[PDB]
Amino acid sequence: PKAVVFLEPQWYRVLEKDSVTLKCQGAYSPEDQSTQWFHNESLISSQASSYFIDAATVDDSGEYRCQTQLSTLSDPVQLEVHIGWLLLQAPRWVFKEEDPIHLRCHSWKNTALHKVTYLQNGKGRKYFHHNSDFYIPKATLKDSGSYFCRGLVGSKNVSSETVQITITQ
Amino acid sequence: CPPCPAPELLGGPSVFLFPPKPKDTLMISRTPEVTCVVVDVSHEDPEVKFNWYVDGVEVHNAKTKPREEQYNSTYRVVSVLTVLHQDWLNGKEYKCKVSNKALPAPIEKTISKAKGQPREPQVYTLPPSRDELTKNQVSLTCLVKGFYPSDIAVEWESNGQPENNYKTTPPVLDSDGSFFLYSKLTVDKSRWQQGNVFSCSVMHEALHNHYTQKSLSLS
Amino acid sequence: PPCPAPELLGGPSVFLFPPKPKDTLMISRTPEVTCVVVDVSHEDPEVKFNWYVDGVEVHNAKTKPREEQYNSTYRVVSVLTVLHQDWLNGKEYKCKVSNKALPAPIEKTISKAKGQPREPQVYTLPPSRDELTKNQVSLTCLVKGFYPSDIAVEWESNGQPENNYKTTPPVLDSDGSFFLYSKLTVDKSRWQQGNVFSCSVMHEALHNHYTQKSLSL
Ligand SMILES: *[C@@H]1O[C@H](CO[C@@H]2O[C@@H](C)[C@@H](O)[C@@H](O)[C@@H]2O)[C@@H](O[C@@H]2O[C@H](CO)[C@@H](O[C@@H]3O[C@H](CO[C@H]4O[C@H](CO)[C@@H](O)[C@H](O)[C@@H]4O[C@@H]4O[C@H](CO)[C@@H](O)[C@H](O)[C@H]4NC(C)=O)[C@@H](O)[C@H](O[C@@H]4O[C@H](CO)[C@@H](O)[C@H](O)[C@@H]4O[C@@H]4O[C@H](CO)[C@@H](O)[C@H](O)[C@H]4NC(C)=O)[C@@H]3O)[C@H](O)[C@H]2NC(C)=O)[C@H](O)[C@H]1NC(C)=O
Ligand SMILES: *[C@@H]1O[C@H](CO[C@H]2O[C@@H](C)[C@@H](O)[C@@H](O)[C@@H]2O)[C@@H](O[C@@H]2O[C@H](CO)[C@@H](O[C@@H]3O[C@H](CO[C@H]4O[C@H](CO)[C@@H](O)[C@H](O)[C@@H]4O[C@@H]4O[C@H](CO)[C@@H](O)[C@H](O)[C@H]4NC(C)=O)[C@@H](O)[C@H](O[C@H]4O[C@H](CO)[C@@H](O)[C@H](O)[C@@H]4O[C@@H]4O[C@H](CO)[C@@H](O)[C@H](O)[C@H]4NC(C)=O)[C@@H]3O)[C@H](O)[C@H]2NC(C)=O)[C@H](O)[C@H]1NC(C)=O
Ligand SMILES: *[C@@H]1O[C@H](CO)[C@@H](O[C@@H]2O[C@H](CO)[C@@H](O[C@@H]3O[C@H](CO[C@@H]4O[C@H](CO)[C@@H](O)[C@H](O)[C@@H]4O)[C@@H](O)[C@H](O[C@@H]4O[C@H](CO)[C@@H](O)[C@H](O)[C@@H]4O)[C@@H]3O)[C@H](O)[C@H]2NC(C)=O)[C@H](O)[C@H]1NC(C)=O
Ligand SMILES: *[C@@H]1O[C@H](CO)[C@@H](O[C@@H]2O[C@H](CO)[C@@H](O)[C@H](O)[C@H]2NC(C)=O)[C@H](O)[C@H]1NC(C)=O
């Protein structure tokens, strides 16, 4: 009878100032449960079914667990709050052949970003005049590798940390 | 109140328009060119159209190069317009107009030669100081002064053959509104003391025949 | 009203300037490094400066009040006096700039150019024989073989300043050193008389940071 934490939106990697809702799912019963929340194995004040982070800061990173009256303590869910201009967000790291790959060059505060490139293994893979999501419709083995994004915000040339994407046979 | 540049200008191809090399506009054996370079052309909207104008009148003899795939996954497209030396030198304006689907309106760049009364440069070669003779390499100095506009070419030779080991300063604005510069040619001390006549060649629009050449030689 | 500058989307920019060459060489002057923050918005006007010398934080910097600019942004300037020897010993000066319109502080670092200092060779060069037909003649100071490019050059005659001169920026020479030229223009009568002129150069690699070279007919 384990509780489960869900993230909405689902990205476990976020930038400072992003909103993040952690949702606690307890037993699937009409029997109203109360909720409790643990962050880095410490109790926090909220007893709400949804724990809402308005404007994330680095200290909001770490492990979250929740529990309801009719539930055992959840497995941990990890939240990583990054500091910087850009974060390349993926819904997962491992894809199989012919799966769609959808990547998002998330900017700090959703600030407008121009002349955006998604690089694969240090070579330009896709360029867009304005910020736009990267889409491979059918993944192939050659799409695996190290990915980051970069672009212009105002006059600043900025870039995201690298992520590893794998395509399996 | 004036209209402002929109943010749509910020994400679209960019255009850079380059003047001809000054040596090319001055010498008969050369063909001066105006170069319009378009960068940040997407793969999604790759077609680039050029129109060229010389004082507002369209010309059709520009040569557009095939697009080049850049390492960053953009295209770069170049169009080159060959120019008449005299057209350039008489201050005619060159307009490159660039059209592309990612742009709401075409981008226009215009270039022409710097305006103002041309002034003839004075060219003077100076031998190395006696003090530098203790050194293994000596400095041969070419002072060029009183030229306007700043567009100029300066070269070095000995026995008809070009010398490679020289450096020329940027043009510097002088008090009288003219420019001056200095070119330093480094030569082996032995090559100087041998009697080789070294030459400083200076090419500027206001010189007779666009060319002057002063010599430098030992005692 | 000014046009909404899109550069503001990126928040403030930071520029970190070295001391003037003369300031570091002459004990009578105070060398300082200048950290200047530009593109500060009205809505996020507070700027915090931290300064570090070789990574150790210092507290003696002088921060000026934010100054409203023509393009409807703020500019704010913080200056840190540096010690002469510290600068010449290659110490690193770090200006960290904090502002709410940034996702993280911007850190800029300045120090003296690295590489062995190389001593200026100073050569004075009389006007070309061709120029002696003119009313004004050019007196040339070639300063060469120097590293770093930080340097100051002046003219005097009879130990008083001559100010009718222009100096080119330093140019990277083909051996990795720098050179420049300075030109003093004087009346031909003064040269043919002939008065004694001096080109004086300041550079760290000179003895007493100073040398003088004379020029005469
Ligand atoms: C809103 O207004 C702002 C304020 O403006 C002033 O009024 C406005 C309204 C306007 O009319 C102007 O007339 C006037 O400037 C304006 O601020 C300006 O912003 C730009 C950047 O956008 C900034 O540009 C930098 O200038 C550097 C040189 O600055 C010195 O020289 C200038 C002119 O020669 C001076 O005006 C300026 O004051 C400064 O002067 C020195 O100041 C110090 C101490 O105060 C003195 O000790 C020194 O003696 C002074 N004087 C002189 C003559 O030196 C330039 O070096 C900068 O860097 C280049 O930067 C760009 C990056 O943008 C790169 O393209 C280049 O590569 C190079 O950068 C560096 O390159 C190296 C790589 O080899 C490397 O070392 C560096 O890492 C690299 N850096 C970077 C970041 O890449 C740069 O061009 C102006 O200085 C600034 N003006 C002032 C007064 O502060 C706002 O931009 C404007 N905003 C909008 C949105 O419109
Ligand atoms: C993807 O890659 C593209 C190409 O790949 C190459 O990148 C370059 C940078 C190179 O390093 C290699 O790594 C790659 O192969 C990127 O394209 C680059 O895009 C930038 C703009 O983002 C262009 O930058 C402009 O550069 C000009 C000067 O360019 C000359 O010199 C360069 C080296 O110094 C050289 O690389 C260029 O090829 C070019 O060479 C000239 O070419 C012509 C003909 O081909 C010859 O006749 C010349 O002799 C030759 N000269 C020399 C020297 O070699 C520079 O002038 C521009 O600065 C102006 O514009 C800026 C705006 O960006 C502005 O901020 C500056 O202050 C300056 O402003 C101008 O000032 C004047 C006078 O004051 C005004 O009159 C203007 O109106 C004003 N303009 C303004 C305000 O806008 C600018 O830096 C770069 O040229 C280009 N490289 C190539 C190659 O095309 C591409 O960006 C990248 N995309 C992405 C998404 O990453
Ligand atoms: C964003 O800000 C970043 C700052 O990093 C910029 O990204 C940089 O863009 C530069 C170009 O504008 C890049 O510099 C060049 O990189 C080229 C790379 O290509 C090479 O490929 C082969 C591999 O087979 C190898 O030789 C090298 O390892 C390189 O990877 C270089 O070719 C280039 O050098 C030029 O090459 C020509 C060849 O004809 C020479 O003739 C010429 O003299 C010249 O030197 C140069 O080094 C840089 O790679 C890149 N940085 C990174 C980390 O990717 C963006 O441009 C800025 N703008 C935007 C909008 O994002
Ligand atoms: C939650 O525990 C985590 C441990 O993962 C803490 O995360 C670190 O926070 C510091 C600064 O606070 C950062 O520099 C580290 O980068 C963080 N690590 C990771 C992996 O993100 C977090 O601060 C803790 N929060 C609380 C309230 O205890």
Residue closest by Cα to atom 90 of ligand 2 = B39
C→B interface, C-beta within 8 Å: 1, 3-4, 6, 121, 123-128, 130-131, 134, 138, 140, 142, 144, 164, 166-169, 171-174, 179-181, 183, 185
Q: B86 — phi, psi (to 5°)?
A: -65, -40
Amino acid at the residue A158: V
- CA–centroid distance for B126 within its chain: 26
Pocket mutation for ligand 4, best pick of A22, A41, A59 (most atoms within 8 Å of C-beta): A59
- C-beta of residue A113 within 8 angstroms of C-beta of residue A105: yes
Kindly list the residues from chain C whose CB atom is less than 8 angstroms away from the CB atom of residue B181.
168
Q: C131 — phi, psi (to 5°)?
A: -80, -20
Cβ contact A124–B70 (<8 Å) = yes
- DSSP line for chain A: -B-EEEEES--SEEETT--EEEEEE--SSSS---EEEEETTEEES--SSEEEESS--GGG-EEEEEEETTSBPPPPEEEEEE-SSEEEE-S-SEEETT--EEEEEEEGGG---EEEEEEETTEEEEEEEE---EEESS--GGG-EEEEEEEEETTEEEEPPPEEEEEE-
Residues with Cβ within 8 Å of residue C190, at least 6 apart in sequence: none
Kindly list the residues from chain A whose CB atom is less than 8 angstroms away from the CB atom of residue C105.
none
CATH class label, C112-217: mainly beta
DSSP label at residue B161: E
Residues with Cβ within 8 Å of residue B100, at least 6 apart in sequence: B12, B13, B38, B41, B45, B47, B48, B49
CA distance A155 to C11: 9
Span(s) in chain A for CATH 2.60.40.10: 1-84, 85-169
For residue B71, give the nearest of A123, A129, A130 by CB distance.
Answer: A123
Q: C147 — phi, psi (to 5°)?
A: -150, 135
CA distance B145 to B168: 13
CA distance C213 to C72: 50
Residue closest by Cα to atom 68 of ligand 2 = B16
Amino acid at the residue B171: P
CA distance C137 to C164: 11
CA distance B179 to A109: 50
Cβ of residue C14 lying under 6 Å from some atom of ligand 1: no
Return the number of CB contacts < 8 Å for A and B.
Answer: 33
What is the resolution in angstroms? 2.2
Q: What's the fold here for domain A85-169? A: Immunoglobulin-like (2.60.40)
Residue C9, SS3?
A: helix
* Per-residue b or e along C63-101, where b marks 16 or more CB atoms closer than 10 Å to that residue's CB: beebeeeeeebbbbbbbbebebebbbeebebbbbbebeb
Shared fold status for C12-111 and C112-217 = yes
- Pairing relation of β-strands A114-120 and A134-136? unpaired
For residue B141, give the nearest of C125, C134, C168 by CB distance.
Answer: C125
Strand-pair partners of A103: A134
Q: Which two tokens stand for residue B13?
A: 């191809």
CATH class label, A1-84: mainly beta
Interface test with A, best of B10, B69, B107 (most A CBs within 10 A): B10
Pocket mutation for ligand 4, best pick of A61, A65, A81 (most atoms within 8 Å of C-beta): A61
Per-domain residue ranges of chain B: 13-112, 113-219
Q: What's the fold here for domain B13-112? A: Immunoglobulin-like (2.60.40)
Residue A37 burial (CB count, 10 A): 20
How far, CA to CA in Å, does C164 sit from each of C155, C168, C195, C209? 9, 14, 15, 24
Cβ contact C10–A156 (<8 Å) = yes
Q: Which two tokens stand for residue B9?
A: 């200008």
Kindly list the residues from chain C whose CB atom is less than 8 angstroms away from the CB atom of residue B121.
none
- C-beta of residue C10 within 8 angstroms of C-beta of residue A155: yes
Cβ contact B12–A112 (<8 Å) = no
**Which atom of ligand 2 sits closest to the CA of residue B39?**
17
Tokens 């109790």 found at? A43
The CATH homologous superfamily of the domain defined by B113-219 = Immunoglobulins (2.60.40.10)
Kindly list the residues from chain C whose CB atom is less than 8 angstroms away from the CB atom of residue B12.
none
- Answer whether B5 touches A (CB < 8 Å): no
Q: Which two tokens stand for residue C135?
A: 């009313």
**Which atom of ligand 2 sits closest to the CA of residue B33?**
47
Q: What's the fold here for domain C12-111? A: Immunoglobulin-like (2.60.40)
Cβ of residue C71 lying under 6 Å from some atom of ligand 1: yes
